Design a protein around this ligand. Structure first.
Ligand SMILES: NC(=O)c1[nH]c(Br)cc(=O)c1O
Ligand SMILES: [Mn+2]
Ligand SMILES: [Mn+2]
Length: 180
């Protein structure tokens, strides 16, 4: 339908393939769970732009299969002594030496921040929440990146929102929590 066409049009093939493998990991059909499909693509794209903004400052953990994700996490923990996370995070920051969980939400950033912080329940994993409204919220108000990079992420998310809006897809997507 329209959501599947949109996702194939605004995301590059690499992200779309990773998103479809996420959907088979979950057991869900991208033709049917189209909001979750789009949310997964959007979150992948943000994680990849975040680590590109970073001499490579960030290690990408999201988007790897689980074997390779835990391999990377364990290697980081073995060479830094940073405490192992209970859930797979999204990136590792080699400058601040901490794991990062990235959240992308259609709700208020502080609501989703509280939800993430309550879930992962580790003071050491840094949380950074982005909305589709240019808002952000991060552990200790430490936004990690400089203003330019955060601006580029915010711009991309708002653009995705407006592209769905032009296709009459935004109302469905925002009223859904699927993919968060
Ligand atoms: N499986 C994950 O790693 C994951 N899942 C959801 Br739902 C939202 C996230 O931000 C995230 O990193
Ligand atoms: Mn993740
Ligand atoms: Mn995340």
């Amino acid at each position: 339908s329209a959501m599947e066409d949109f996702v194939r049009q605004c995301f590059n093939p690499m992200i779309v393939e990773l998103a479809e493998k996420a959907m088979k990991e979950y057991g869900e059909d991208p033709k049917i769970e189209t909001n979750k499909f789009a949310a997964i693509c959007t979150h992948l794209e943000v994680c990849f732009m975040y680590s590109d903004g970073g001499k490579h400052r960030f290690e990408i953990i999201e988007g790897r299969d689980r074997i390779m994700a835990w391999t990377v996490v364990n290697s980081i923990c073995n060479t830094t002594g940073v405490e192992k996370p209970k859930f797979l995070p999204d990136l590792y920051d080699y400058k601040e030496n901490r794991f990062i969980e990235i959240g992308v939400t259609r709700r208020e950033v502080h609501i989703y921040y509280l939800e993430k912080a309550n879930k992962i329940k580790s003071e050491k994993t840094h949380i950074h929440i982005f909305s589709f409204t240019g808002e952000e919220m991060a552990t200790k108000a430490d936004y990690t990146l400089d203003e330019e990079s955060r601006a580029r992420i915010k711009t991309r998310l708002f653009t995705i929102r407006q592209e769905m809006a032009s296709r009459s897809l935004w109302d469905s997507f925002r009223q859904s929590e699927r993919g968060e």
